[PDB]
Design a protein around this ligand. Structure first.
Ligand SMILES: Nc1ncnc2c1ncn2[C@@H]1O[C@H](COP(=O)(O)OP(=O)(O)OP(=O)(O)O)[C@@H](O)[C@H]1O
Ligand SMILES: [Mg+2]
Lengths: 74, 630, 73, 80
DNA sequence: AGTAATCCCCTTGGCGGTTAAAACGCGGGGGACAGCGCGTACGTGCGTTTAAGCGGTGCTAGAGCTTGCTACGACCAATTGAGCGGCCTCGGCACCGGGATTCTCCA
DNA sequence: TGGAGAATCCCGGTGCCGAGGCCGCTCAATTGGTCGTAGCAAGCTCTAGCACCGCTTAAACGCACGTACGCGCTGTCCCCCGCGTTTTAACCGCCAAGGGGATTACTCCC
């Protein structure tokens, strides 16, 4: 769902904060992407319930923030 | 096999509501209208939720028949507004709205209704004064009567208006003196008792099921049948044409249903509807070579790991044999000490490991080491070669067993097959939870197939798993094999049980679609048996009504609809009751023909409301009369 | 050097991820909120995946290092 | 026996006050009892599993703490 | 070496009372929830352009595997004192009462 | 704004029981030497990770514009709160029991 090359570049860009000139095995990036897509999809499910519960069909930033607050991510 | 014997399937293209041609303003109708005698001309509008039908009272059929829809939009390229109000909308952009509240007989989008009426008067050829007869829902809401009257008198200025009921116009057109009028339309199903040409609307009942609901319900059932995925865009406009073309009423639902998916004869019970699919060596040799080398590399990697496991297991085997060579003629402490170097605990555990390694191995400066590793492969090759010797002679022994004890040998294959199936059952029925042989089974079953005249393929384990022994394949794909590769065999729906399940909602509303209302036979029987004999002004009830149960509206046109209703009512009435069920002639247009014939009679002109009477009384007011609402 | 690549997860990509989560309609402020979510997640996965890589004194991060990092969530 | 009704309305009120709740629908009380016993039916079956596997006919505080810790709700104070 | 009586201990069960907490009644308030109007903000469709994806070429970092040994931890026996179980006490925290300060609500 | 009165705080007094320190001793941590080995180091192999080019077209963006839906507003009514009354069962204490686990006796069997 996310385009592969701009996800590679996002991974590299993040990693440089921890160790310069790391290398990533091709299978390691796909394992990160497949976990991120599965994480975002699974969070949007939980936000959609937060909108629907507030009688809103349209998800809103406070729906992300309620989902994460109850999942204990914040 | 049946699918090899059966003919090629017969397949029907998808139909949908489609535009076909333009029609101009029909100025000859306006000319003829101006030629009529005074007070003998009117415009007749059958305000049907499926079709608005309109024309001149002096003519035998409508000039117009259009869906009560509008489409209006701004062309993003040309920059101008376009507007459409019937089948002139292609049902090219389908920005459609409908005048009626979905699945009901009541007009509620008055902007669409005005556009529909604009199209009606334009195509009838009015350009600037004419009396209007318009059909109306049973027990129609006063607010909708008001809103329709306001449009007719204040937007269009018409001299007089009258409302009547399409069900009752249809009855009077067919000489309806007294009877029970049964109407199934697009929006609804009604039973109205009619006495001395006057409807007893206080005793009428509505079902809330009709030809719209059947199209929607057929759509739900098809989207469920192919829930794993269907490539065509399933629309209820298509399922309406499927309901028209293929559905029929059962004369004995439970007996016809219980056998409907039986593989024998399903060829003639199924009907197949097909959506518009699209039809889709150096290249292969080079690619296959790259595949072949990649496969060879995987084979080498497996064999290299297998050879590592061969050398490991043989070196392990040699160590465990080195223990055994000591343990024979050494103390239990020496047995235990050598076992402790293995961290094993039993001589027979070394025996098991020695054999199990051999049982595994049989399946699969430097020169002294290299050859002794190759000698471990020769120890492996001795197990491998002794495996070859074992199997060849054991098979020859069993071939003698077949010759010499054939029936007992067959009986052995049954006993073994069952025992192996028991282990598979002990695996699977448990592992279906506990997860949270097969070649032996086959080989036994193969010899049983080869020589056991008691055996059959139908008891083969594979036959227990075969698509042609399933039910859901018959439900989804019928008597014939299926593959998702074929673009022609995908993009087709098999209607099967829905041939009969959809009409039967009229008779079994709660059981089949949860409508939570009495079925058609129970509605009609409650009127005939319980209500009309109680109503004190009526004479010769029920019997006078039984002599004409009358079917009206398009959604009655299913095959066997009449005989099903007759046989259902026959069981509710006293023996020898003179029950007749009768169909309207041309059960769709016939409601307009009744309104047109009635339009200018003295009965109608007594019921007409003039513009000035509307201005006096307001739009809720109506002249109560035989064919209209109270 | 790399900068601003979090704008590489486009708004259509966030639509696809939301629709697959069953969402009907999306407030226009979701798109930056989703990035603040994805980045805070992907940082603390990669923090461990790299920690498992400088332990064992190596320089490629492997799929197993990713797997061990996810397993720590 | 139904000592779940011994989790009274005032007690479910007090727990919601500590949870910071101002106003409570009267339907909440039976929902909360249904949620409480589903919690206990997970922790006690594990605390029993420990006493059973450790072959004792009494349930100790540490059986519960292992049960909780394995359920994911680490409790400090009763051993642990 | 076995099986049963004897005896410790610690858990469950019952009885009484006392009083503090749960249940019950009742007025009213204000918060839940359906209804309405608008308006702006999100979904749709089109033309645009941007770069992700694929097939292909080139290099070298470094993952992965083998060889060789010696530095470091496993194992045991003798030594001893750091850490645990039991006893003591006094001072911190609670618990009460009473007058002082705060906050709430109707005027 | 005031006021009345209830509810929350504070100040000093009382007492009880548990926190902090002392004592005896065991046994678990330390000292000393042994020995096996594993993982630290040096070295070779070639996998696969990174870089670049050129092409294709599907995917991303900016914009027009309609209408579906979020939000503040209004009205009601019902139902949950604050407070007085009634009642029941939680808490405490004291006695019983039983059970079970370790120990001790006495015989038979090896
Ligand atoms: N031959 C047919 N067999 C079965 N159903 C049919 C047939 N022809 C038409 N229909 C269906 O019957 C319905 C047409 O009903 P009809 O036109 O009589 O009602 P209407 O006047 O439009 O509706 P209403 O009175 O509910 O507003 C549609 O659902 C149509 O698909
Ligand atoms: Mg009709």
């Amino acid at each position: 769902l996310i385009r592969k090359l701009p996800f590679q570049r996002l991974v590299r860009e993040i990693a440089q904060d921890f160790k310069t000139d790391l290398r990533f095995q091709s299978s390691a990036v796909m394992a990160l992407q497949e976990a991120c897509e599965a994480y975002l999809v699974g969070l949007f499910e939980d936000t959609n319930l937060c909108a629907i519960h507030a009688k809103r069909v349209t998800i809103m930033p406070k729906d992300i923030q309620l989902a994460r607050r109850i999942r204990g991510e914040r | 096999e049946p699918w090899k014997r059966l003919p090629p399937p017969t397949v029907y293209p998808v139909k949908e509501a489609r535009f076909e041609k333009y029609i101009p303003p029909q100025l000859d109708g306006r000319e003829r209208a101006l030629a009529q005698p005074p007070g003998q001309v009117a415009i007749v509008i059958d305000n049907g939720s499926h079709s608005v039908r309109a024309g001149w009272n002096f003519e035998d059929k409508p000039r117009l028949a259009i869906p009560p829809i509008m489409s209006k939009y701004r062309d993003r390229k040309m920059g101008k507004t376009f507007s459409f109000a019937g089948s002139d909308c292609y049902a090219a952009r389908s920005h459609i709205r409908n005048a009626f509240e979905a699945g009901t007989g009541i007009v509620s989008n008055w902007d669409v209704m005005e556009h529909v009426l604009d199209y009606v008067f334009v195509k009838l050829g009015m350009n600037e004064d004419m009396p209007i007869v318009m059909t109306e829902a049973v027990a129609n809401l006063p607010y909708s009567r008001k809103s329709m009257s306001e449009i007719i008198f204040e937007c269009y200025g018409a001299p007089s208006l009258v409302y009547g009921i399409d069900s009752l116009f249809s009855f009077r057109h067919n000489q309806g003196q007294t009877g029970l009028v049964v109407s199934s339309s697009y929006s609804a199903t009604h039973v109205i008792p009619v006495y001395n040409r006057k409807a007893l609307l206080s005793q009428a009942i509505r079902l809330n099921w009709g030809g719209w609901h059947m199209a929607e319900y057929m759509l739900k059932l098809l989207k469920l049948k192919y829930y794993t995925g269907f490539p065509g865009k399933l629309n209820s406009s298509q399922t309406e044409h499927m309901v028209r073309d293929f559905c029929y009423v059962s004369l004995d639902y439970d007996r016809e249903l219980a056998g409907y998916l039986d593989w024998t004869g399903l060829e003639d019970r199924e009907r197949i509807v097909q959506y518009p699919y699209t039809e889709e060596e150096e290249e292969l040799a080079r690619i296959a070579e790259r595949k072949k080398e990649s496969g060879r590399r995987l084979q080498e990697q497996a064999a290299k790991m297998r050879l590592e496991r061969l050398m490991k297991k043989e070196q392990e085997l040699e160590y465990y044999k080195d223990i055994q060579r000591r343990m024979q003629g050494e103390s239990k402490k020496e047995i235990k000490r050598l076992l402790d170097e293995a961290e094993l605990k039993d001589e027979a555990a070394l025996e098991r490991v020695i054999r199990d390694l051999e049982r595994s191995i049989k399946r699969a400066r430097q020169q002294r080491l290299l050859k002794s590793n190759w000698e471990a492969r020769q120890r492996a090759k001795a197990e491998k070669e002794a495996e070859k010797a074992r199997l060849a002679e054991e098979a020859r022994l069993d071939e003698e067993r077949r010759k010499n004890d054939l029936e007992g040998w067959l009986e052995e294959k049954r006993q073994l097959r069952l025992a192996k199936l028991n282990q598979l059952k002990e695996r699977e029925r448990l592992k279906a939870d506990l997860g949270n042989l097969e070649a032996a089974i086959r080989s036994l079953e193969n010899d049983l197939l080869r020589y056991d005249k008691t055996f059959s393929y139908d008891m083969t384990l594979d036959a227990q798993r075969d698509w042609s022994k399933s039910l859901l394949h018959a439900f989804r794909y019928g008597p014939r094999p299926f593959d998702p590769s074929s673009q022609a065999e995908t993009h087709r729906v098999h209607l099967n049980v829905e041939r009969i399940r959809v009409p039967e909602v009229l008779f079994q509303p709660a059981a089949i679609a949860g409508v939570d209302q009495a079925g058609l036979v129970e509605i009609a029987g409650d009127i005939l048996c319980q209500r009309l004999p109680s109503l004190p002004g009526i004479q010769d009830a029920p019997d006078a009504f039984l002599r004409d149960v009358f079917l009206t509206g398009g959604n009655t046109l299913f095959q066997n609809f009449d005989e099903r209703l007759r046989q259902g009512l026959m069981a509710l009435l006293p023996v020898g009751a003179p029950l007749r069920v009768r169909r309207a002639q041309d059960a769709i247009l016939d409601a307009w023909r009744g309104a047109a014939g009635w339009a200018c009679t003295e009965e109608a002109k007594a019921a007409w409301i003039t513009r000035e009477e509307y201005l006096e009384k307001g739009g809720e007011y109506i002249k109560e009369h035989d064919l209209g609402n109270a | 050097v790399l900068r601003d690549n979090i704008q590489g997860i486009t708004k259509p990509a966030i639509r696809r991820l939301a629709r697959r989560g069953g969402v009907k309609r999306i407030s226009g402020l979701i798109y930056e909120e989703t990035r603040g979510v994805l980045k805070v997640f992907l940082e603390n996965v990669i923090r461990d995946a790299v920690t498992y890589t400088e332990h064992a004194k190596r320089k490629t991060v492997t799929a197993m290092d990713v797997v061990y990092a996810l397993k720590r969530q």
